[PDB]
Each structure stands twice: as C-alpha cells, then as structure tokens.
Scaffold this motif. Structure first.
Motif, PDB file in Angstrom:
ATOM      1  N   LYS A  15     156.790  99.244 -25.573  1.00  0.00           N
ATOM      2  CA  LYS A  15     157.375 100.018 -26.647  1.00  0.00           C
ATOM      3  C   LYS A  15     156.323 100.936 -27.250  1.00  0.00           C
ATOM      4  CE  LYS A  15     156.670  96.551 -30.252  1.00  0.00           C
ATOM      5  NZ  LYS A  15     157.291  95.702 -31.313  1.00  0.00           N
ATOM      6  N   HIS A  34     164.156  90.766 -32.018  1.00  0.00           N
ATOM      7  CA  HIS A  34     163.706  90.213 -33.282  1.00  0.00           C
ATOM      8  C   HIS A  34     164.872  89.511 -33.950  1.00  0.00           C
ATOM      9  CE1 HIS A  34     160.308  93.455 -33.676  1.00  0.00           C
ATOM     10  NE2 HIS A  34     160.168  92.673 -32.620  1.00  0.00           N
ATOM     11  N   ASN A  75     152.599  99.521 -26.819  1.00  0.00           N
ATOM     12  CA  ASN A  75     152.446  98.079 -26.933  1.00  0.00           C
ATOM     13  C   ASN A  75     153.141  97.519 -25.697  1.00  0.00           C
ATOM     14  OD1 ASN A  75     152.691  95.325 -27.435  1.00  0.00           O
ATOM     15  ND2 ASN A  75     153.485  95.570 -29.521  1.00  0.00           N
ATOM     16  N   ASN A  96     160.038  87.411 -26.909  1.00  0.00           N
ATOM     17  CA  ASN A  96     160.018  88.092 -25.623  1.00  0.00           C
ATOM     18  C   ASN A  96     160.142  87.059 -24.516  1.00  0.00           C
ATOM     19  OD1 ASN A  96     159.235  91.130 -26.075  1.00  0.00           O
ATOM     20  ND2 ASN A  96     158.018  89.914 -27.520  1.00  0.00           N
ATOM     21  N   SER A 135     156.626  85.112 -31.900  1.00  0.00           N
ATOM     22  CA  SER A 135     155.742  85.173 -33.050  1.00  0.00           C
ATOM     23  C   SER A 135     156.620  85.094 -34.285  1.00  0.00           C
ATOM     24  CB  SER A 135     154.893  86.455 -33.052  1.00  0.00           C
ATOM     25  OG  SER A 135     153.902  86.387 -32.040  1.00  0.00           O
TER      26      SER A 135
HETATM   27  C1  LIG Z   1     151.522  88.625 -28.090  1.00  0.00           C
HETATM   28  C2  LIG Z   1     150.632  88.804 -29.273  1.00  0.00           C
HETATM   29  C3  LIG Z   1     150.259  89.998 -29.677  1.00  0.00           C
HETATM   30  C4  LIG Z   1     150.754  91.167 -28.904  1.00  0.00           C
HETATM   31  C5  LIG Z   1     149.362  90.213 -30.878  1.00  0.00           C
HETATM   32  C6  LIG Z   1     148.396  91.280 -30.460  1.00  0.00           C
HETATM   33  C7  LIG Z   1     147.447  91.630 -31.287  1.00  0.00           C
HETATM   34  C8  LIG Z   1     147.566  91.150 -32.698  1.00  0.00           C
HETATM   35  C9  LIG Z   1     146.609  91.751 -33.694  1.00  0.00           C
HETATM   36  C10 LIG Z   1     146.542  90.764 -34.816  1.00  0.00           C
HETATM   37  C11 LIG Z   1     145.486  91.034 -35.836  1.00  0.00           C
HETATM   38  C12 LIG Z   1     147.885  90.753 -35.479  1.00  0.00           C
HETATM   39  C13 LIG Z   1     148.987  90.364 -34.513  1.00  0.00           C
HETATM   40  C14 LIG Z   1     150.321  90.471 -35.180  1.00  0.00           C
HETATM   41  C15 LIG Z   1     148.991  91.141 -33.211  1.00  0.00           C
HETATM   42  C16 LIG Z   1     150.006  90.525 -32.259  1.00  0.00           C
HETATM   43  C17 LIG Z   1     151.096  91.421 -31.843  1.00  0.00           C
HETATM   44  O1  LIG Z   1     150.931  92.684 -31.769  1.00  0.00           O
HETATM   45  C18 LIG Z   1     152.363  90.877 -31.366  1.00  0.00           C
HETATM   46  C19 LIG Z   1     152.896  89.508 -31.279  1.00  0.00           C
HETATM   47  O2  LIG Z   1     152.238  88.444 -31.677  1.00  0.00           O
HETATM   48  N1  LIG Z   1     154.126  89.440 -30.781  1.00  0.00           N
HETATM   49  C20 LIG Z   1     154.572  90.767 -30.405  1.00  0.00           C
HETATM   50  C21 LIG Z   1     155.931  91.182 -30.797  1.00  0.00           C
HETATM   51  C22 LIG Z   1     156.303  92.495 -30.166  1.00  0.00           C
HETATM   52  C23 LIG Z   1     155.963  92.645 -28.715  1.00  0.00           C
HETATM   53  O3  LIG Z   1     155.657  93.538 -30.812  1.00  0.00           O
HETATM   54  C24 LIG Z   1     157.767  92.550 -30.321  1.00  0.00           C
HETATM   55  O4  LIG Z   1     158.419  91.757 -29.701  1.00  0.00           O
HETATM   56  O5  LIG Z   1     158.270  93.375 -31.040  1.00  0.00           O
HETATM   57  C25 LIG Z   1     153.466  91.596 -30.830  1.00  0.00           C
HETATM   58  O6  LIG Z   1     153.401  92.907 -30.717  1.00  0.00           O
END
Ligand SMILES: C/C=C(\C)[C@H]1C=C[C@H]2C[C@@H](C)C[C@@H](C)[C@@H]2[C@H]1/C(O)=C1\C(=O)N[C@@H](C[C@](C)(O)C(=O)O)C1=O
Length: 378
Positions: free
Chosen positions: A333, A90, A345, A78, A61
């Motif tokens: 985490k 990150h 998460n 990831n 992301s």
């Molecule tokens: C794999 C995708 C998700 C887990 C999404 C889950 C719900 C979303 C809610 C949305 C409104 C915002 C967005 C940023 C979130 C997104 C989110 O929480 C993310 C995401 O896009 N990538 C991860 C990154 C992660 C695991 O937190 C990390 O590697 O640190 C993550 O936590």
C-alpha cells in the motif's frame, strides 16, 4: 485488576502527555498511556504466525494510535496463503481495554479487547509469557483463533536501552519465538477461506510489543520488520532509518538465535555497505538486495529482498549472513501520493538462505518481512 479502558470520545489527552516508564525484565504489556491516550502516541501489540514452509502467514497488530483519532483503536490484520490469496483488513473499534491480573503490573496475566460496545478482537497473554491466545469474532470478516506456545527464548529487555528501537521509541519481543497454531475463517469478497496450522506442523510466530510518544512516520524514512526461521536459526528484526533531519540515523532492535540460544543481541544497526569483521558489540546490518531471485517491491525501493548480517561480539566473533528474498507479495500500500517521490508499505513472505559466515553452512527457511518506506520530508 489493573485496567486501561479507552472508549467513547474523550479518551484522548489535550496535549502530548508522557507514558509510563519501561519496566525492566517485563513484557511491558500493560499500556503505557493507561488512562488518557496522548494524541501523538502509538501503542502496538503484535501477534503473528506462519507455516514453517511459507505456505501461510498471518499477522495482527492491535493499535492504540492517538494521532489517528477518532479512529484510534484498530486491529490491523494481514493473511497470506501459498495459493496467492491475501487478506488484509482493519477492525476499527470504539473500545480498547487492557487488563493485567495480579499485584505486579509488569508480570500479570494480560487480556486486551478491541471491541464494539458486531466486532470483537482480543488477545490474552499468560503472566509468565508462556502462552498467548488471540481470538477474532468479526462475523462476515474473520473468526477464529491464534495461539502461541513460547519456546522460552531469552528476549526481555533488561534496561530502557534494550527496549529501544530508536531514542525514546520502543519495540521489542515479549515472546521471541513460539509454536504457533491458527484456526481461522476469512470471508473473501459470499465465500469463506480457512487457515489452519495445527500444533505439530512447525508453524511459528512471536509476540512483539511497541510504544512511542511521537508519531513515528515523521521520524523515519525506512522501517523493516523481519521474522524468519532457517534451520537452527531464528531471527527477528525491527530496524528504523530516520529522516534526513537526523542524518538517517540507523537503529534496530533485533535478535538472532541458534537452537534457541541468543547468538546476536543486535541493538546496533550497521551501515548497509559494510561487510567487515569489526565487532565491539552485537550488531545487525540490513541491506536492500537488488540482484538475484525475488519479487521486486513496487514503491520507492525496487528491492528483491534483504540481506541480514548478524555479528557477535562474543569471543568467537561469529557472523551470520542470510538472504531473505521476496517469495510472495503479501500486502502493498502507498505511504505517500504516487510519483517519483512515492513510497510504500510492503509485506512479503520471504525465502531464507544463508548461515555462519566462513563455514559450509547453507540453511533454508521461511519468514516474513514488512518493508516500510516514508518520505524524506521537506
Ligand atoms: C508488521 C509490522 C510492521 C510493518 C511495523 C513496521 C515498523 C513499525 C515502526 C514502529 C516504530 C511502529 C510500528 C507501528 C510499525 C509497524 C507497522 O508499520 C505495521 C504493523 O505492525 N502492522 C501493519 C499493518 C499494515 C500493513 O499497515 C496494515 O495492515 O494496514 C503495519 O504497517
């Protein structure tokens, strides 16, 4: 060339400022906070890929997160291998630039670069959304590329409502389904590990696009990301459950495809304990599973997976039900301090079973879930 360049230490706006509007029938890939970034906004460009047999999975992301300034620019990565290896880092960078080439800011060739002024992470999306390229140049951490070849699934939102994942919050899929290739090298804490998925191996993924003018953690208690393929079915989900101050509003932007035809355009999220046949609109029900096979999640909910029940308001009134059971723990985490109120998460590679309700169909496949828990709040 349209240019959104955020760099230095004065990129943040003073107050929350509005983002630009949803563009119908567009990937909306150009940033909605083009010049200054609202301190409560978050923009996300997501690209992923997994092997058709669950032997590998990858997701990145690209973030512009106003609330986490100064470190607002971030490619969150990831990676998982069937042998148990997982890799999560990150790439925090000082520069995020997105350009769109062409006269139409909603339909141009887009390039994004999270980079130092060594770390480079970049994405490139064709103007017709037919292909993507993601390239990492982060020596000592990750190098290589990801690519998508869109399968041309219908996906783009035709209205503000169709782009929403909740009121005034947007998450949808500029590319719903793509042939994915991966050719990546990861440095494991000096050891290197490869992830290679070639163009003919059936690896798949998509491109997701999101933006919110509010910090989403203060609005939700639950977030579920899904991308899965099982037989002819491809399913992708972003489901949110709000905080109790909005009475656990249940919202979703999701889609089920069968052989590339959209069979549930699910913008309605049903109460998890319903299993009825009502269908005044396409809908999906997401239900935490606690019984049967699957790794147990570690934080608030001890679930072994999720059930996804899609409904069609089409004339045949079809329902599809899939069980997505935790097969490999990908990431985990905390999202709060530990203890009885603790939340987390968690990412999983999931094994997928199910199919058309009322039929003999029993398909089998693989996918990923991202299962986010947040505090119920004071
Ligand atoms: C794999 C995708 C998700 C887990 C999404 C889950 C719900 C979303 C809610 C949305 C409104 C915002 C967005 C940023 C979130 C997104 C989110 O929480 C993310 C995401 O896009 N990538 C991860 C990154 C992660 C695991 O937190 C990390 O590697 O640190 C993550 O936590």
């Amino acid at each position: 060339p349209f240019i959104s360049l955020l760099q230095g230490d004065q990129f943040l706006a003073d107050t929350p400022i509005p983002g630009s509007a949803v563009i119908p029938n567009s990937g909306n890939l150009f940033p909605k906070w083009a010049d200054k970034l609202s301190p409560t906004a978050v923009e996300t460009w997501l690209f992923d890929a997994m092997a058709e047999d669950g032997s590998a999975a990858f997701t990145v992301s690209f973030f512009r997160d106003g609330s986490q300034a100064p470190a607002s620019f971030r490619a969150a990565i990831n990676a998982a291998w069937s042998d148990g290896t997982v890799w999560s880092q990150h790439l925090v960078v000082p520069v995020s630039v997105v350009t769109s080439d062409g006269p139409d800011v909603g339909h141009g060739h887009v390039a994004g670069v999270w980079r130092t002024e060594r770390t480079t992470a970049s994405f490139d999306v064709a103007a017709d959304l037919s292909t993507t390229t993601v390239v990492f140049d982060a020596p000592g951490r990750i190098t290589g590329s990801l690519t998508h070849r869109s399968l041309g699934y219908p996906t783009l939102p035709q209205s503000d409502r169709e782009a929403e994942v909740a009121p005034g919050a947007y998450w949808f899929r500029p590319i719903a389904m793509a042939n994915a290739t991966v050719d990546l090298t990861f440095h494991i804490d000096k050891t290197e590990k490869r992830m290679v998925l070639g163009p003919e191996q059936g690896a798949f993924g998509g491109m997701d696009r999101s933006w919110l003018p509010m910090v989403w953690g203060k609005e939700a208690t639950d977030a579920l990301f899904v991308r899965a393929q099982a037989g002819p079915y491809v399913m992708a989900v972003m489901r949110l459950v709000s905080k109790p101050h909005k009475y656990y509003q249940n919202t979703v932007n999701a889609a089920l495809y069968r052989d590339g035809k959209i069979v549930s355009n699910a913008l309605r999220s049903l109460p998890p304990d319903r299993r009825d046949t009502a269908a005044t609109a396409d809908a999906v029900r997401t239900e935490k599973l606690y019984d049967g096979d699957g790794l147990v999640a570690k934080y608030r909910d001890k679930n072994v997976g999720y059930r996804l029940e899609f409904r069609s308001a089409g004339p045949e009134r079809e329902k599809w039900s899939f069980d997505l059971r935790h097969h490999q723990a990908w990431w985990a985490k905390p999202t709060s301090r530990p203890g009885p109120d603790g939340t987390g998460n968690s990412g999983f590679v999931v094994e997928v079973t199910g199919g058309l309700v009322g039929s003999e169909e029993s398909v089998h496949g693989w996918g990923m879930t991202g299962e986010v828990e947040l505090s119920d709040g004071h």
